[PDB]
Symmetry: C3
Subunit: 404 residues, 3 copies
């Protein structure tokens, strides 16, 4: 029952200790409180009545903002995003390129506005300040952790960019993990437009801050000693829209290629597998059969562990956007496999993160520009940071499945 979930938490913490740079350097106050906060935050917004009301209140607010931004894409693509599309094409009336992608543009512009008004910095300063006073973490890495709740892995350290080139290896690692254990506000609204429950996306985004610090200070404890704009609001909006556009193009081109490549892989595996009496062999079967124990370990039922492993595995070997693209049909009535409500939540939390190998290259570019002489350290701690970011997603998935 609930004993399998508690064991899963110990295992995830166990692997982090086994892969630690120095187990004797682990601060029990830091990693003890970090796990406590992430667990208490999960208990707050997923179990207790008041916490559930605040989460559903914030999610409904986000849901309204998404629909407001949909007035912009309704102007551009007109009837191609109307209700007539379902009367003509049926299920194929939902055009991903016109429905989901423009949401990245609007939200990137919105966050850019909220940054100009100082609204974003005000929230991060509170959340980041509460983390460093409770975990003992440094000022910079705590602000980057709180920033990563809303923005991306390369946009979050911008709030503390003059402290990046001279921060310790443990600090930089935590900064890398803070962005790998979380997502961005843009893609969040995109995933919500695909059918993913906003309550799960918002929850996982907030739990990514202490969870990101947790496995960062576990796999890389602090052994050294730390230290310590657009002209107008319309320019900020226009600048954010351009950034969202460039992101929307890249994501769209990525999904065309990757899904196409997977389709190519499945075609080859159908022939390769046939040589061993398995002509129905596909990528989903491999990822499902390989990630089934990991899914079963975090709280997914035995008869649903294989199906859940297909999505968790795809999120790891590729990225979460490709995984969510194959998990989205499982959130509708036309789902090939009817999953339990708890399982749908666990997959949603275990997929809510930029934790993948391809994000290392992005960290080498964006974060690497903030510290050009630190690109050697980033690439070196790259693989370790992905694991630490992965464990944070699995931990948040185990906690979520525990209180459900």
């Amino acid at each position: 029952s609930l004993f399998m979930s508690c064991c899963g938490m110990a295992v995830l913490l166990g692997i982090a200790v086994l892969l630690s740079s120095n187990r004797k350097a682990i601060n029990l106050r830091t990693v003890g409180g970090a796990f406590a906060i992430q667990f208490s935050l999960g208990a707050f917004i997923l179990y207790v009545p008041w916490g559930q009301e605040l989460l559903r209140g914030f999610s409904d607010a986000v849901s309204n903002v998404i629909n407001y931004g949909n007035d912009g894409t309704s102007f551009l693509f007109g009837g191609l995003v109307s209700g007539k599309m379902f009367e003509v094409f049926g299920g194929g009336g939902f055009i991903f390129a016109f429905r989901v992608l423009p949401t990245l543009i609007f939200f990137s512009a919105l966050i850019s506005v909220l940054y100009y008004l100082g609204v974003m910095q005000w929230v991060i300063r509170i959340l980041g300040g509460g983390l460093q006073k409770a975990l003992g973490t440094s000022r910079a890495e705590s602000m980057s952790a709180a920033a990563n709740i809303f923005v991306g892995q390369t946009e979050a350290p911008l709030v503390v960019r003059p402290f990046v080139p001279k921060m310790t290896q443990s600090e930089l690692f935590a900064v890398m993990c803070g962005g790998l254990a979380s997502i961005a506000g843009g893609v969040l609204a995109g995933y919500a437009s695909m059918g993913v429950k906003i309550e799960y996306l918002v929850a996982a985004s907030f739990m990514a801050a202490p969870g990101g610090l947790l496995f960062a200070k576990l796999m890389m404890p602090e052994t050294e000693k730390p230290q310590d704009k657009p002209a107008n609001v319309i320019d900020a909006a226009a600048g954010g829209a351009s950034a969202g556009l460039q992101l929307a193009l890249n994501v769209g081109a990525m999904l065309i290629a990757f899904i196409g490549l997977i389709a190519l892989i499945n075609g080859m595996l159908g022939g390769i597998g046939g040589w061993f009496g398995m002509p129905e062999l596909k990528l989903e079967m491999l990822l499902g059969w390989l990630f089934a124990p990991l899914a079963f370990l975090i709280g997914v039922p035995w008869n649903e562990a294989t199906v859940a492993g297909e999505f968790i595995g795809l999120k790891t070997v590729a990225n979460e956007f490709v995984a969510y693209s194959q998990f989205a049909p499982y959130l509708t009535e036309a789902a090939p496999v009817v999953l339990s409500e708890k399982t749908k939540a666990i997959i949603s939390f275990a997929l809510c993160g930029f934790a993948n190998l391809s994000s290392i290259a992005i960290l080498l570019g964006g974060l690497g520009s903030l510290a050009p002489k630190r690109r050697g350290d980033i690439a070196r701690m790259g693989v370790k940071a992905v694991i630490a970011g992965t464990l944070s997603n699995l931990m948040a998935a185990t906690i979520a499945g525990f209180f459900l």
Copy 2:
């Protein structure tokens, strides 16, 4: 009657004098002839028979070029830009992204071709030469003023780029105002594809050259002393298409975000206004109530001044493309408010310009690259240039409304 329009002209000229850098330095020949030319040009193509035939002859020529370029977008988007779209989606069959945006690509390529053939330079040299000999303005700023009739604010000073880094503060200001008081040929054909009368777009584009010089030499008189390529035509076309593409993407992403942001604003104003007994409070009401006297001053009837203020205000606080997007439905039979034919013209002229705060950043980039040590002067005279560019649009709107 016509007395309200003549008073409006005096007020607009009055504000320019009150905001002048030096009223005693104002050249009466320059600003006297500039206003005379803009007024005589308005009287020419909007009142006298022969001038109306030349304007309708040029507009029909432009209209044919647009339809010719529509063969390119008809190939790419096939039936999505066909007549079957209106039989299926009705009014929503008109897809802005496929109908209007590709026009920016084709026209940017066309102008790039006409530049290679020396056709563009030939016309600018004539118009620019006639301005400097009649107003006493310098060679460079007069050519940039004539160039801004056809191309954008950052593309126009390219004809005199070796004279930009060493031109006086009054010259640079006039160059800034020349591009703020006008638009580009690309977006012009785009606005014409939205229902905006081409006769008004072409007229306002030509009146922007003396009008841009008028309020520039009024708010910033000359107190100092002035001075004085693609391999083939296919490469020029291909280069212009790429420039139009990048512009089409930026405009499209801007409209998705801004309209979405306005929709978000209207949602918040509906709650904020409800606290003061005004739950129906929107952005249009504010902009309408605030710009109604300004609209009434330039020649808009009392019962239509508020509605006209919504578009003029939106053009100012944001940009003219967002304003035209909300004014375009008022040019069809499905218009919520039936405006008089004169009012439709006044709004069309008062919106035909890049006069906004966001264009300062564009001037800092494009025009600033032509003179990197002059970015300080551009940002300093930025706000003043927007006002001077705004007054030119209002003046052209007052003149247009006078002869109608």
Copy 3:
């Protein structure tokens, strides 16, 4: 009969000799074997039974890869690329922007993957090694020739980029011609999606390697003495998708402008021609009337030489993508002119190449970046390389028409 084709080969070789930099420097072994290989390769895959089975086997493999990549574009554009489009819009249901363009993205990602796995380098090393040992050509130019079978003109010399800045004028010319006589794998799958027979595209791509070396060593013999990475596979795929996206945008914007410009040209020619009693005068008539002898010379029947000249001429004065766009309707049942099966093949081979004036600018950019001090030589030998690349397409078209 077959005598007209053999004469055509002599003429094409004749022009190359007449335009040679030094006819006495022509290596008879090099240009003798190069023509022999291209001719024997044509005889292999177009005449003999076994060679036809290997070509149809490779084409069917490519055809399957295209359909696999179509799963990615089916996810993004949903029902807009479904069969319901033909039930609603009929022939206009085929949306070029959603059907053909995304194929460039997927294939660019695929080739990027095959490069990471060393699969591409393995094939090029074999083909390139077999050319230098049979023709006596240098190591670098032979590898670039073999690479150009699969990738573009600026991507092919990347396999030998440290040898580019110090290669002779004859080597650099052959490198330029290798990319002008061939296409890329991305656009190849795009042309195949337009109805162009894959067997012809694959054949012409392979015949472009010895044909590119043939007319390069004919028009520019060697008179001097020659000499002698992504972190993971997912990063390689993501990087290739981004490159394909940027290419897809440029091609799409080019087709909108060029077709629109041609439509503008046809409008003007209709009036200009009317002054000389030819109101039906268009661009196709000119290109057809002018390239008819050239089409008749390579093996096109007398009554079909004019129609074929329209496509060959358009491929020359513009690019092959614009030509293929106007030739694609002639491959369907709704073709205005029913062409013979041999003629359809000849046009397909004569159009399969980047041989145009606009590709010189691309060579100055991409290839010029590999050798910044050699941009002077590239621009100088630019026009000659286009001709040499053109003759290679015509030669491959004559050979193809000979064995059919």
